[PDB]
Structures are given as C-alpha cells and as structure tokens.
Short mmCIF file of C-alpha atoms and ligand atoms in Angstrom, two decimals:
data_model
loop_
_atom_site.label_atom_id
_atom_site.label_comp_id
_atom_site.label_asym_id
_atom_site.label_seq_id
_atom_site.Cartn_x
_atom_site.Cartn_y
_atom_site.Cartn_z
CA UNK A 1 -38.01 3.23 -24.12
CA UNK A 2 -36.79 6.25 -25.44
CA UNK A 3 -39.09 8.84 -24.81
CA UNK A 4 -39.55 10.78 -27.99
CA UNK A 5 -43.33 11.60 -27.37
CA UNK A 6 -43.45 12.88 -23.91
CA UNK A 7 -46.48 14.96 -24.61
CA UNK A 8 -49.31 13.93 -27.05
CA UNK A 9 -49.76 11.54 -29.46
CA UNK A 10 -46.85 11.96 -32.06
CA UNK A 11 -43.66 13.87 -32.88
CA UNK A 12 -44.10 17.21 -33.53
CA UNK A 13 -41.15 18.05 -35.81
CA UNK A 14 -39.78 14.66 -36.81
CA UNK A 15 -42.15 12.86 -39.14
CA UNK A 16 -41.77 9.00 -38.31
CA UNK A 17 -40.25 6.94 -35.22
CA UNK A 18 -37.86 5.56 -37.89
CA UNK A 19 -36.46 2.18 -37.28
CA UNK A 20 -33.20 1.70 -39.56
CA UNK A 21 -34.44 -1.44 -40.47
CA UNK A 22 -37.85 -0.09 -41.81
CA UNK A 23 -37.86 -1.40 -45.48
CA UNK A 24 -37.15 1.27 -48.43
CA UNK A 25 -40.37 2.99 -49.91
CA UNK A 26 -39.10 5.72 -51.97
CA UNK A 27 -41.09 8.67 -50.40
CA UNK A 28 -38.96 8.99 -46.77
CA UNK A 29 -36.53 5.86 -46.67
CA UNK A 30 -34.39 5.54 -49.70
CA UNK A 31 -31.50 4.74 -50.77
CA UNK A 32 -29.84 7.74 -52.33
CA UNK A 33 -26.86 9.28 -54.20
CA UNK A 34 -25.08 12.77 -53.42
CA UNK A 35 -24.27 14.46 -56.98
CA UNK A 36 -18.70 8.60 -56.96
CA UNK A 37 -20.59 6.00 -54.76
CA UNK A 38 -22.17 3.14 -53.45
CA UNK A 39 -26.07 4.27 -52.55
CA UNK A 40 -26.27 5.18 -48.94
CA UNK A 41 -29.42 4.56 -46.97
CA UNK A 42 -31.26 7.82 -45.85
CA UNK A 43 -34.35 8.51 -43.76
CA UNK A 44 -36.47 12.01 -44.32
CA UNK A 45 -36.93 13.62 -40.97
CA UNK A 46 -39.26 16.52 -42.57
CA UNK A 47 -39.70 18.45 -45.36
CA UNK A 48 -36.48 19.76 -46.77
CA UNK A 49 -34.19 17.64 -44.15
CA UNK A 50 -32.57 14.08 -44.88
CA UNK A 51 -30.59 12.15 -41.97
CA UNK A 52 -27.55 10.00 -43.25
CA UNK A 53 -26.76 7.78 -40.70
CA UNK A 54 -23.12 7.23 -41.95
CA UNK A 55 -19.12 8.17 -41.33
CA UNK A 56 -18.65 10.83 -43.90
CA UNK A 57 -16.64 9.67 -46.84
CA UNK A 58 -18.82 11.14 -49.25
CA UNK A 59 -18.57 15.10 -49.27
CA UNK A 60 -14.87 15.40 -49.53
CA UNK A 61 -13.09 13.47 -51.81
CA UNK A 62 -10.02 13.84 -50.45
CA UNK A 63 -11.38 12.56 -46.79
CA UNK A 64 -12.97 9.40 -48.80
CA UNK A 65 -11.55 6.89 -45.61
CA UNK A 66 -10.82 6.97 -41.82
CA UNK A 67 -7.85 6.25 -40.83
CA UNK A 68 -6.12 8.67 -38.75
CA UNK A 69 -3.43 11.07 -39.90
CA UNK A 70 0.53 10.35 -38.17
CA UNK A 71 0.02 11.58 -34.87
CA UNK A 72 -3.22 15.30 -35.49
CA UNK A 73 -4.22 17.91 -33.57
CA UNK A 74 -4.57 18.06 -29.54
CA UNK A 75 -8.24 18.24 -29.85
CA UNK A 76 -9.48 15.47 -31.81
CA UNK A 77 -10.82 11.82 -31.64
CA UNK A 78 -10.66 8.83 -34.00
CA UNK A 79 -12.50 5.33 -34.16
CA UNK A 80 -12.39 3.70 -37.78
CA UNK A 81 -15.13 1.05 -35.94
CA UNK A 82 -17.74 3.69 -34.77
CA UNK A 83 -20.96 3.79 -36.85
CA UNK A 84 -20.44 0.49 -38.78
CA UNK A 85 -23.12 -2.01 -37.17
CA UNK A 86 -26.51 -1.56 -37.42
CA UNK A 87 -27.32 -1.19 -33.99
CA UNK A 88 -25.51 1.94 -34.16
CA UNK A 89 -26.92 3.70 -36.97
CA UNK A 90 -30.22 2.54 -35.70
CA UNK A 91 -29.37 4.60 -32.02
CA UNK A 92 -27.89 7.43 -34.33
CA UNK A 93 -31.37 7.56 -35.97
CA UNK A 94 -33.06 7.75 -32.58
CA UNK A 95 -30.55 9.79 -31.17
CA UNK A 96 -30.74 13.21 -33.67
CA UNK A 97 -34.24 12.05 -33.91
CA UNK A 98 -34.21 12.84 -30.69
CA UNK A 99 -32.37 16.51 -30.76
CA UNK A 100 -34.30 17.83 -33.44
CA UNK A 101 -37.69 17.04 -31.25
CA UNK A 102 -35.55 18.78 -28.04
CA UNK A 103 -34.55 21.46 -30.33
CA UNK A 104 -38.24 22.05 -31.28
CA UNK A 105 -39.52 21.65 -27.69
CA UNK A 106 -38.52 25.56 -27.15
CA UNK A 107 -39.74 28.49 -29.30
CA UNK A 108 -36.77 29.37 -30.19
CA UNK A 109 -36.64 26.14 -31.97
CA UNK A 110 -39.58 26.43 -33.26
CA UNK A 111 -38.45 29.78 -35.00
CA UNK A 112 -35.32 28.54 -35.99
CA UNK A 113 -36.26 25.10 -37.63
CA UNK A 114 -38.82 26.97 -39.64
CA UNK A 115 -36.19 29.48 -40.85
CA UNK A 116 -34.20 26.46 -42.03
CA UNK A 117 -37.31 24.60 -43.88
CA UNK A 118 -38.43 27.87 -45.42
CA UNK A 119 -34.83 28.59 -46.75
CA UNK A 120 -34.80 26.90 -49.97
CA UNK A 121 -31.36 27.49 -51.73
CA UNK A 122 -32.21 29.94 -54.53
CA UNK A 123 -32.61 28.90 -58.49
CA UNK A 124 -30.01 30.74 -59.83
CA UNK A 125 -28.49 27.67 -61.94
CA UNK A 126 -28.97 29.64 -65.40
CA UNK A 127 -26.11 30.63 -67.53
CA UNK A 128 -28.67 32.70 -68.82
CA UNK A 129 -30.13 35.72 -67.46
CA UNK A 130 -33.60 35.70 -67.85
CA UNK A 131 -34.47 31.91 -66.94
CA UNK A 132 -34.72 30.64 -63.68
CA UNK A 133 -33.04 26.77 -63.09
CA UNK A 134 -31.71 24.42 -59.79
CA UNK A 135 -28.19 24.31 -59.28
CA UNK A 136 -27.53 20.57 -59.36
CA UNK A 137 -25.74 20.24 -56.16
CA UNK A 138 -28.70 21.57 -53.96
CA UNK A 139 -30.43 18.51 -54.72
CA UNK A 140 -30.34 14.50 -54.16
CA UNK A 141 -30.96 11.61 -56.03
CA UNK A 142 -33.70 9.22 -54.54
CA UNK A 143 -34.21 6.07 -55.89
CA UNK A 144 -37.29 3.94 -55.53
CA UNK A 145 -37.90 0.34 -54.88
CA UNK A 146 -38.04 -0.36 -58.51
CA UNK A 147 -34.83 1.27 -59.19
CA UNK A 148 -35.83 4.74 -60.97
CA UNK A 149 -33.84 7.36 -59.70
CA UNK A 150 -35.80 11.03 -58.97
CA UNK A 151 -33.73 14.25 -58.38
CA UNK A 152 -35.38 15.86 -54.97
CA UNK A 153 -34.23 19.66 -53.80
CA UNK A 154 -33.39 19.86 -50.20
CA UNK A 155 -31.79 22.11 -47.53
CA UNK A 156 -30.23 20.01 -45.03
CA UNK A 157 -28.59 16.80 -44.75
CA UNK A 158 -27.15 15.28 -41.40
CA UNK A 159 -24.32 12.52 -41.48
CA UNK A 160 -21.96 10.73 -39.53
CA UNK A 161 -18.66 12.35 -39.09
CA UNK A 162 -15.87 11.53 -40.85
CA UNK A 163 -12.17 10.10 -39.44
CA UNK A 164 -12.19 12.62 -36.89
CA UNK A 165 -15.03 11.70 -35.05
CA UNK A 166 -15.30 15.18 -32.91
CA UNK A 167 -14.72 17.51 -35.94
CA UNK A 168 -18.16 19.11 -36.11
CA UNK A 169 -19.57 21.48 -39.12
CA UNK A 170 -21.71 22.78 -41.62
CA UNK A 171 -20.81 22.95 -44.95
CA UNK A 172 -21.79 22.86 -48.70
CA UNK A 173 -21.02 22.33 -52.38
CA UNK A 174 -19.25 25.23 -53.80
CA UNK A 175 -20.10 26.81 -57.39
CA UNK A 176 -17.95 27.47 -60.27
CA UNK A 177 -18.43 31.49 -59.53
CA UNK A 178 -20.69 31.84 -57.89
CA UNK A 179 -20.32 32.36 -53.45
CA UNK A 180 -23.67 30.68 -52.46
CA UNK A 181 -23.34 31.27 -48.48
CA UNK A 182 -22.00 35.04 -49.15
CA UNK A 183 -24.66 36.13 -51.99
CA UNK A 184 -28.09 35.77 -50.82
CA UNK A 185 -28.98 32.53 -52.47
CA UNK A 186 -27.97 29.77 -50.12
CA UNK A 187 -26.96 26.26 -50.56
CA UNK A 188 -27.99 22.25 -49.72
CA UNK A 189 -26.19 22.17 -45.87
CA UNK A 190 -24.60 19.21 -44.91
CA UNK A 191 -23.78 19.02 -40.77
CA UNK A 192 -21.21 16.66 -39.81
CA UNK A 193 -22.46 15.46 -36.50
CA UNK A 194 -22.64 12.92 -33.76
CA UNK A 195 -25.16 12.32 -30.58
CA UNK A 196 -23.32 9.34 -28.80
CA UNK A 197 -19.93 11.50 -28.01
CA UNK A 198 -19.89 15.21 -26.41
CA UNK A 199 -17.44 17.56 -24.87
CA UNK A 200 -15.72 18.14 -21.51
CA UNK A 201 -15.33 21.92 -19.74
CA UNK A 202 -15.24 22.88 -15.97
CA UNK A 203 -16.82 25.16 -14.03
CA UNK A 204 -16.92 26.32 -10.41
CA UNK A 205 -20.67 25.98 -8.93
CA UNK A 206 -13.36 23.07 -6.56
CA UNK A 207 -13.84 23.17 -10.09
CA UNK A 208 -16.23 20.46 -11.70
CA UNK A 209 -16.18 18.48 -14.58
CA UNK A 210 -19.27 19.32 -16.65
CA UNK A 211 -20.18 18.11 -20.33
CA UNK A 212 -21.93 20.10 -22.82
CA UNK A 213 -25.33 19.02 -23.54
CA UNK A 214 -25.75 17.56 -27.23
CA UNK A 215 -28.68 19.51 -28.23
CA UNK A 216 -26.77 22.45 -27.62
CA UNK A 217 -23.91 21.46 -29.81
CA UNK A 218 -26.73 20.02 -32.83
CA UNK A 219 -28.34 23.93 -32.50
CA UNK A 220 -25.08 25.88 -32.94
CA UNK A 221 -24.38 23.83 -35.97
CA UNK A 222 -28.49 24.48 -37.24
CA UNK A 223 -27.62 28.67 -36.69
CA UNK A 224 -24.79 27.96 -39.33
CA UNK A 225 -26.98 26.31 -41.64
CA UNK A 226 -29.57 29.38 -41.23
CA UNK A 227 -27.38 31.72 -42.07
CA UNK A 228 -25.77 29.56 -44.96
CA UNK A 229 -29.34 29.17 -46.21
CA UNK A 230 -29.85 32.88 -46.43
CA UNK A 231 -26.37 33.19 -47.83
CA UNK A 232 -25.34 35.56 -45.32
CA UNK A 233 -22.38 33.81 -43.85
CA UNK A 234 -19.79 36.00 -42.91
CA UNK A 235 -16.62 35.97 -44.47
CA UNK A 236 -13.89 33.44 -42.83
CA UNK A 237 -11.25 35.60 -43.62
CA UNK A 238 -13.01 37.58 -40.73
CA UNK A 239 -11.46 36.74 -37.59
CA UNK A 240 -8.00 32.13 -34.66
CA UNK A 241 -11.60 33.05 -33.88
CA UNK A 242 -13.95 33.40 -36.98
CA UNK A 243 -16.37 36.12 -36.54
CA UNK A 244 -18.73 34.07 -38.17
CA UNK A 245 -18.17 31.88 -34.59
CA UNK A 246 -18.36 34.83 -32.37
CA UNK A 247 -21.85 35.65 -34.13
CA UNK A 248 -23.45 31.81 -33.83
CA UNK A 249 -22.38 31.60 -30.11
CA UNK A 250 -23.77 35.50 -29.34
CA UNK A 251 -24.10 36.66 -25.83
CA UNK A 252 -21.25 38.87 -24.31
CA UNK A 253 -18.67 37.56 -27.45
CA UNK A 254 -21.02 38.60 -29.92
CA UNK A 255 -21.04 42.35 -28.61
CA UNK A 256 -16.80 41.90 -29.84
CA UNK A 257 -17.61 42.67 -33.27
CA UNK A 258 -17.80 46.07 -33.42
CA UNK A 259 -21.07 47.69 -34.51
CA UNK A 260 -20.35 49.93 -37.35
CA UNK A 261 -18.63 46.53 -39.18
CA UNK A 262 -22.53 44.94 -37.92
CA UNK A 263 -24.03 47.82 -39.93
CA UNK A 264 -21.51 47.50 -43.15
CA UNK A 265 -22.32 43.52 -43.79
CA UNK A 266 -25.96 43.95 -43.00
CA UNK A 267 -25.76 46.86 -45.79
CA UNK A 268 -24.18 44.37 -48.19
CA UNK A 269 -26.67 41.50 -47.56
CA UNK A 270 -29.34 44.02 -48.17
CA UNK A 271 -28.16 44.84 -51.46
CA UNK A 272 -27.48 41.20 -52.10
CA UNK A 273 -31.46 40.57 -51.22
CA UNK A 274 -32.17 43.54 -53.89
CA UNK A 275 -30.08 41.77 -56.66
CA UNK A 276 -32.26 38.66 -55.92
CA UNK A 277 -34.88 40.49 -56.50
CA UNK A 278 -34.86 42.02 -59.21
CA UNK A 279 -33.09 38.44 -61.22
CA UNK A 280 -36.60 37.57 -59.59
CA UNK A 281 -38.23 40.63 -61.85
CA UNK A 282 -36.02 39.95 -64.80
CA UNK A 283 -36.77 36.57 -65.23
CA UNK A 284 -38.98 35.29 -68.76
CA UNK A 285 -38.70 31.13 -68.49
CA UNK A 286 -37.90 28.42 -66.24
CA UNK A 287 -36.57 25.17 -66.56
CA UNK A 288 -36.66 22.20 -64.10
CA UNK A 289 -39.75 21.65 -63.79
CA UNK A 290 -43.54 21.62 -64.34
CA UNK A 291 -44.07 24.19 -62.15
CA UNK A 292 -44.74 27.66 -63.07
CA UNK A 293 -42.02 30.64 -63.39
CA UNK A 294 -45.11 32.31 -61.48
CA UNK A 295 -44.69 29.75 -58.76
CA UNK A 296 -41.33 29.45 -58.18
CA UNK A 297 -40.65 33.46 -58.10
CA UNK A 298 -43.55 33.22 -55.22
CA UNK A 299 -41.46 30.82 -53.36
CA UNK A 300 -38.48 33.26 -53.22
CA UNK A 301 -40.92 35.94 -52.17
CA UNK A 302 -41.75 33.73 -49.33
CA UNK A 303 -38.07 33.06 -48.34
CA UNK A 304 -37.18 36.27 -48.45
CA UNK A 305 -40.20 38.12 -47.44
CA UNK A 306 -40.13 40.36 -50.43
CA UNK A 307 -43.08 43.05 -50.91
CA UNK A 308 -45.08 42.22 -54.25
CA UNK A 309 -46.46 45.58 -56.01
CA UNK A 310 -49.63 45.72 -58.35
CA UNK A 311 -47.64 45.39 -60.89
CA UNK A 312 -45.96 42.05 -59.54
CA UNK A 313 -42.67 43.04 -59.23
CA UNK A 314 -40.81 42.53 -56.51
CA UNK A 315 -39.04 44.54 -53.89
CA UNK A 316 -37.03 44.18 -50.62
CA UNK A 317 -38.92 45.70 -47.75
CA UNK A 318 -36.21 47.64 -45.35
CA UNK A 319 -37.91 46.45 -42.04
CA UNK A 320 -38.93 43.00 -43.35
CA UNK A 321 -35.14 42.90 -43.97
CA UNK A 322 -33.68 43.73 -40.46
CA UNK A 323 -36.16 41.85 -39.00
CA UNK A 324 -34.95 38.34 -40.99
CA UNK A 325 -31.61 39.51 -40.52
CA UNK A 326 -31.59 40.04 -36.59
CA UNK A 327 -33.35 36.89 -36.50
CA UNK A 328 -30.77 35.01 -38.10
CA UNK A 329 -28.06 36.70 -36.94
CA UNK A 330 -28.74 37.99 -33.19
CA UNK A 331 -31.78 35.81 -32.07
CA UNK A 332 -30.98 32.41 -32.95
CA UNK A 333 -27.45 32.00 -31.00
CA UNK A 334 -25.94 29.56 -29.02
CA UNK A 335 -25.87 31.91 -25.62
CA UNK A 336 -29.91 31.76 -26.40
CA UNK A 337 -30.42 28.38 -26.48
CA UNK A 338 -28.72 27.86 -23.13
CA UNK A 339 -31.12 30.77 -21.98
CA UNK A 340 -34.19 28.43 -23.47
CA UNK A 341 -32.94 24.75 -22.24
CA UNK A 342 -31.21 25.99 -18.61
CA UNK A 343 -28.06 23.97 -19.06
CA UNK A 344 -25.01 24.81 -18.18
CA UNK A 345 -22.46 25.59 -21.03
CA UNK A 346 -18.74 27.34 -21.49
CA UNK A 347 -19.53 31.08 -21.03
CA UNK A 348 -17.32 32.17 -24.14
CA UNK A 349 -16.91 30.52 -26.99
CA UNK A 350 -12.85 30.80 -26.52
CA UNK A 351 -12.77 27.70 -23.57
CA UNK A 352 -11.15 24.78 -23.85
CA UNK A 353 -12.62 21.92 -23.77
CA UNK A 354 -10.71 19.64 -21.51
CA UNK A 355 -12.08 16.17 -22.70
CA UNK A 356 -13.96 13.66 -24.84
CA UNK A 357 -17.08 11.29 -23.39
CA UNK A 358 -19.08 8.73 -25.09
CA UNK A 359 -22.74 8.77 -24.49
CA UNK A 360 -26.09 7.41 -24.86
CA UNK A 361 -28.75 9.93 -24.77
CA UNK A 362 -32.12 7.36 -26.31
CA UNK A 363 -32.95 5.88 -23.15
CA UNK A 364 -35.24 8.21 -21.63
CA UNK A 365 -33.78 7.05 -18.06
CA UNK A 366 -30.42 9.10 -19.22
CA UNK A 367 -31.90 11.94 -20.92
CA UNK A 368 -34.89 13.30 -21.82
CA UNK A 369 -36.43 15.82 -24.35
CA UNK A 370 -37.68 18.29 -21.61
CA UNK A 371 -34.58 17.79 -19.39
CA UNK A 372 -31.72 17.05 -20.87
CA UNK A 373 -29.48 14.86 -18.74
CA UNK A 374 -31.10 17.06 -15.74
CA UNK A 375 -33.80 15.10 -15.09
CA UNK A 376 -36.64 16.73 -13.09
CA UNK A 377 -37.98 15.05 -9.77
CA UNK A 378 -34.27 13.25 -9.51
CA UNK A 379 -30.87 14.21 -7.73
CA UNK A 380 -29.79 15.33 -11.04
CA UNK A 381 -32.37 18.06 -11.41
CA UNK A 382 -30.63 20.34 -8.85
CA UNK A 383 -27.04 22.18 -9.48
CA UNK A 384 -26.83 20.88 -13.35
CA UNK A 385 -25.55 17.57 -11.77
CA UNK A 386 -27.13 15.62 -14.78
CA UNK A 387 -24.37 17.19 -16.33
CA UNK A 388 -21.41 16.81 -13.78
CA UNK A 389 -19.17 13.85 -15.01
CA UNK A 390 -18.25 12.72 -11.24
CA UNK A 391 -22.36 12.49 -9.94
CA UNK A 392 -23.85 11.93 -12.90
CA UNK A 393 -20.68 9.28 -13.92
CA UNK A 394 -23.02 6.33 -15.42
CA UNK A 395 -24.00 8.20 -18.35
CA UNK A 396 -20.34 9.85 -19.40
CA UNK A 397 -17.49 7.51 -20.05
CA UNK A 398 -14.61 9.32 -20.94
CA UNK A 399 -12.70 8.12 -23.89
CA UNK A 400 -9.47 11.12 -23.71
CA UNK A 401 -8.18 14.08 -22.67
ZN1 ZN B 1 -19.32 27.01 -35.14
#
C-alpha cells in the first residue's frame, strides 16, 4: 500500500495510479521517440508532463551507455544494473508519482506546478518573421497502438539518470541561435532524477547523520525548470557556485547576489518579455497547426500575462512582470519548500554532502505524502528522526561515502 490518496477519492495532480505494466493506449501510455532510438515506454502524469522511467542514454549522445569513467569525481555513484527490471521502473513510476502529489500537497506547490504547466515553450521556430511555428525539439513523438506516430508539444519530461546515478539536473535541447532559457521563450525540460537514492549531511540537534528528503531534491530541480520555461535562467558564466544555484536554493544565500545585479537581469528579462511581444504583434500566419494565429498569440498572452489593448495588440504590463518574476525567482526556492514541508535540510547550499543511501519511499509505512519520512503519531515524528540515518536506520541503507 502506498498511500498516494491519503485524502479523497483520487490524485489531485497526477492523473492515473499508473501501473508500468498498464497496456499502451496512445493518449497517456505510449511508446515514444525524443527528436537515434529504440521507442521508450512513457506514462503522462498531466498535461504538459511525461515520466520516462529509464537510465538516460537518450539526451546526450555522447553519454549514450553506463559504464563508469577510470576512477570520477569524489561525489558520485554508479550502478550499470539499477533501473533495468520491471519491478523497478514500476516503483520509479510510483515513486515520482508519489513526489509530484507531495509536491502539490503544499501551496507552494500548487503555485509552482501551475507555473510549470502554464509555461509552454514559445513558437518562435520561424525563419521568417511574421509567422509563428514549434521548434521541433519542444515536442515528442507518440505513437499509437496501430503504429501512427503524432508529434505532441510538452514542457517537462522526467527520466532515469544516466551512468552517474546521483548526477541530478534540468536541462534542454539547444537551438542553432537562438538561447531558449536566456530569451524569454523557454524550452521542453528534461530532469534527470531518481526517488530510490538520496543524500547524506549532518547536523547538530554530537552531530547526526540526517538525509535530505526526496521531495525536496525533485522541487529544487522543478524551480530550474520554471525558470527555464520562462527563459529567464541566469547566465552560468555567473558564479564554483552558479548564481543561478544560489537563486533556486534562496534563503540567507540568495541575499549573496547583490541587489543592483537583481535589478540589471530583471531589466533584461523585461525587455526580453517586450520583444516577445511585439514578434506576438508582428506576426501575419502560422504554421503547425489547425489552430488559429488568433489562438496561439492568446496562449502566449496567458503565459506571460501580457495586457491586450482594444486594438489587440499586446503589451508587457510592468507589475504583472515583477510579480511573475519574483514568483519565479524569489518565491519558489528551495529554503521555501523546507519552510512548507518542516524537514530538515543543509542550511546553505555550499554543504557537503557526506554520503549516498538507497531508499524506498512507496510504502506508505516508510514515507508518506503529508509526512515525509517523519511520520506523525510515531517516534519518528519528533526531532526529524524520520530523517536521522542511526533511528530511523531501516529505511536508509547506505551504499558510500
Ligand atoms: Zn541546482
């Protein structure tokens, strides 16, 4: 028993208690192709958002296997066998299943997932000017029980990780010219990511051995999607420590970057929403498509909560602008969503982590969408000792340090 529907009748975020043995239909289990390879079965958790439960040896062509490099960095962690039954990618289903209904138990969640599904990566695909078209690789191909193949526009995919099994991110297809996560329009995410490992710190209140709470991890990776969806990533040339990192975990590390360089990127992202907006304004045709150029400039003015004269043309609205931008950049943060679960987490972004545990968070007797590993009513609801690795040592078994 695992849980996910402590409170109603179904899950609120995630559309079907998936079973990865539940036949393929074509609509939200398929077997699909990123834009080569082998089709890879995929399950749609909700509108805009595909789960790949897979090791990643798709996205980068030159990571296209597992095996380890000569003995790699301090911290890292590789198991060529992890992910390759079905067992597994059926408790990797449950597991981020799982998360995202965790994630979405708190209103920061809430906020935050609906950021993500509103932020469709922008059509700016056309070589020329005035027409509006999809860039190919924001999109994936879905093929249907007969075999036809259909081309479906999404904003977030998460997979398996790739050889090093620890090596969390978020990241995208590149264009030709144009910087997608730096220009306003956004781009298909794709978050390497497991739920049956997490990560080792200590803390005093001797020192204990504490591990980081999954959910945690899955929503610092979802506040780099956001602002990858908005295209207002921050430059990783800015930083080592990334201020782009600094940002996503917030809280006292945020405050580092100085707030005169705040007001100087915000500036440029605003300008960046203006040149949106008037391509937006510009634009005679589309192609794609049997929607209407009509329709598809209105979902843009929903993304970016653009101000629509008489005249229907568009125009970036100054406070509508800071507000989407604080949101994405100073509300949804890491230091928050410890705030919103009460979990104990590394208080800068800078710690160590000291080691490497395999999990199991389905049960609902190890971990639970209210409660984490914390459970309520139990000796591990007091002093975070769901967390501690010593009391709590059934559900942690530690695999290196
Ligand atoms: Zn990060």
């Amino acid at each position: 028993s695992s849980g996910l529907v402590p409170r109603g009748s179904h899950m609120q975020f995630v559309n079907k208690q998936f079973n990865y043995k539940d036949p393929v239909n074509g609509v939200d289990i398929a077997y699909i192709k990123i834009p080569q390879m082998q089709p890879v079965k995929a399950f749609k958790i909700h509108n805009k958002i595909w789960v790949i439960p897979e090791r990643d040896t798709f996205t980068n062509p030159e990571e296209g296997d597992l095996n380890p490099p000569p003995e790699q960095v301090p911290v890292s962690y590789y198991d060529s066998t992890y992910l390759s039954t079905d067992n597994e990618k059926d408790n990797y289903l449950k597991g981020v299943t799982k998360l995202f209904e965790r994630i979405y138990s708190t209103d920061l969640g809430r906020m935050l997932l609906t950021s993500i599904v509103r932020g469709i990566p922008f059509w700016g695909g056309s070589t020329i000017d005035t027409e509006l078209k999809v860039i190919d690789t924001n999109c994936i191909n879905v093929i249907q029980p007969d075999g036809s193949y259909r081309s479906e526009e999404l904003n977030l995919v998460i997979i398996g990780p790739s050889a090093d099994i620890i090596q969390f991110e978020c990241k995208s297809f590149g264009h030709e010219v144009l910087n997608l996560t730096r220009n306003g329009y956004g781009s298909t995410q794709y978050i390497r990511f497991s739920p049956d490992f997490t990560f080792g710190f200590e803390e005093s209140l001797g020192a204990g051995k504490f591990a980081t709470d999954p959910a945690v991890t899955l929503a610092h990776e979802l506040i780099h999607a956001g602002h990858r969806l908005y295209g207002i990533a921050i430059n990783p040339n800015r930083v080592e420590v990334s201020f782009e990192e600094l940002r996503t975990f917030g809280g006292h590390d945020a405050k580092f970057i100085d707030s005169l360089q705040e007001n100087e990127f915000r500036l440029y992202y605003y300008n960046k929403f203006k040149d949106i907006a008037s391509t937006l304004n510009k634009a005679k045709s589309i192609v794609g498509t049997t929607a209407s150029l009509q329709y598809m400039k209105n979902v843009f003015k929903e993304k970016y909560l653009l101000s629509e004269d008489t005249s229907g043309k568009f125009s970036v609205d100054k406070l509508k602008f800071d507000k989407l931008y604080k949101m994405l950049t100073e509300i949804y943060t890491e230091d928050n969503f410890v705030k919103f679960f009460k979990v104990l987490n590394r208080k800068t972004y800078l710690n160590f982590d000291k080691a490497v545990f395999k999990i199991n968070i389905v049960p609902k007797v190890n971990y639970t969408i209210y409660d984490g590993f914390n459970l309520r009513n139990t000796n591990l609801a007091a002093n975070f000792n769901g967390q501690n690795t010593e009391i709590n040592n059934m559900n942690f078994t530690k695999l290196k340090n």
